[PDB]
């Protein structure tokens, strides 16, 4: 199966500049815990934001264009992408906008972070449709020294 993993602020907001309008080390920890030892599909811009491969996972980039880092696996099509993983149980699609927009239809599971914050952004998360999904997990957490905002992790299964 394929899985999307995102952190949404208010209004399904996923970013500004080519940045995340928040800083939540504990979300990343959760991100990391969910992906580790699994293939992660990103897009040229997301990749540019990360800025270096992710240890313990096969990092695949989406560029129509030629790759500029030998450390990671480059791809020019979704099919390529899906191909570049091979035979694994779960492949993780890590955005951004456009990539998400294209993978939702193929996804079977979501791992979302509902950040409690109203910030303005330029990239929004694909419009999933409630009736299709089954929220099968939730965990709440309050702002703290580290995490300026509370957030709720959730997990949904394409019904
Ligand atoms: N909150 C989160 O959970 C989360 C997760 C990821 C990203 N983000 C944020 O989202 C924003 C970036 O997302 P975005 O939608 O702007 O971009 P993106 O998906 O990260 O970057 C898109 C690029 O991907 C390449 N691409 C995408 N689909 C492709 C296809 N089928 N074949 C070839 N190339 C393809 C293109 O290549 P070329 O440039 O080579 O033409 C395109 O410019 C940032 O602010 C980022 O931090 C948030
Ligand atoms: N739930 C979730 N939250 C996010 O912040 C997120 N971010 C992306 C895209 N951006 C990033 C940016 C940084 C790291 C990152 O640094 N990962 C490290 C964690 C800690 C660190 O930066 O030191 C890792 O090892 O996984 C991952 C993805 C994709 N899916 C997400 N999914």
From Swiss-Prot:
Q: Report domain DHFR positions.
A: 1-158
Write the protein's name.
Dihydrofolate reductase
Kindly give the InterPro entries that the UniProt entry links to this protein: DHFR, DHFR-like_dom_sf, DHFR_CS, DHFR_dom
Recorded consequence of changing residue 16 to F/S = Increases catalytic rate about 2-fold
Where, in this chain's numbering, is substrate bound? 5, 27, 52, 57, 113
Please provide one cellular component term from the Gene Ontology annotations of this protein: cytosol
Q: Name one GO molecular function term.
A: NADPH binding
Give a yes or no for keyword NADP in this entry.
Answer: yes
Q: Which UniProt keywords apply?
A: Antibiotic resistance, Methotrexate resistance, NADP, One-carbon metabolism, Oxidoreductase, Trimethoprim resistance
EC number, as in UniProt: 1.5.1.3
Q: Describe the reaction catalysed, as an equation.
A: (6S)-5,6,7,8-tetrahydrofolate + NADP(+) = 7,8-dihydrofolate + NADPH + H(+)
Q: What happens after mutating residue 152 to S?
A: Increases catalytic rate 1.5-fold. Increases catalytic rate about 7-fold
Q: Which GO terms describe its biological process?
A: 10-formyltetrahydrofolate biosynthetic process; dihydrofolate metabolic process; folic acid biosynthetic process; folic acid metabolic process; one-carbon metabolic process; response to antibiotic; response to methotrexate; response to xenobiotic stimulus
Q: Mutating residue 30 to G has which effect?
A: In strain: 1810
Q: Which family does it belong to?
A: Belongs to the dihydrofolate reductase family.
- Gene name, Swiss-Prot/TrEMBL: folA
Function text: Key enzyme in folate metabolism. Catalyzes an essential reaction for de novo glycine and purine synthesis, and for DNA precursor synthesis.
């Amino acid at each position: 199966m394929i899985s999307l993993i995102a952190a949404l602020a208010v209004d399904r907001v996923i970013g500004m500049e080519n940045a995340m309008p928040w800083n939540l080390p504990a979300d990343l920890a959760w991100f990391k815990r969910n992906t580790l030892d699994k293939p992660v599909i990103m897009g040229r811009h997301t990749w540019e934001s990360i800025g270096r491969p992710l240890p313990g996972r096969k990092n695949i980039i989406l560029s129509s264009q030629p790759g500029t880092d030998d450390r990671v696996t480059w791809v020019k099509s979704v099919d390529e992408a899906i191909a570049a993983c091979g035979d694994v149980p779960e492949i993780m699609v890590i955005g951004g906008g456009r990539v998400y927009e294209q993978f939702l239809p193929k996804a079977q599971k979501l791992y979302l972070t509902h950040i409690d914050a109203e910030v303005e952004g330029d990239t929004h998360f694909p419009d999933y449709e409630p009736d299709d999904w089954e929220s099968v997990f939730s965990e709440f957490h309050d702002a703290d020294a580290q995490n300026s905002h509370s957030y709720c992790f959730e997990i949904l299964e394409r019904r």
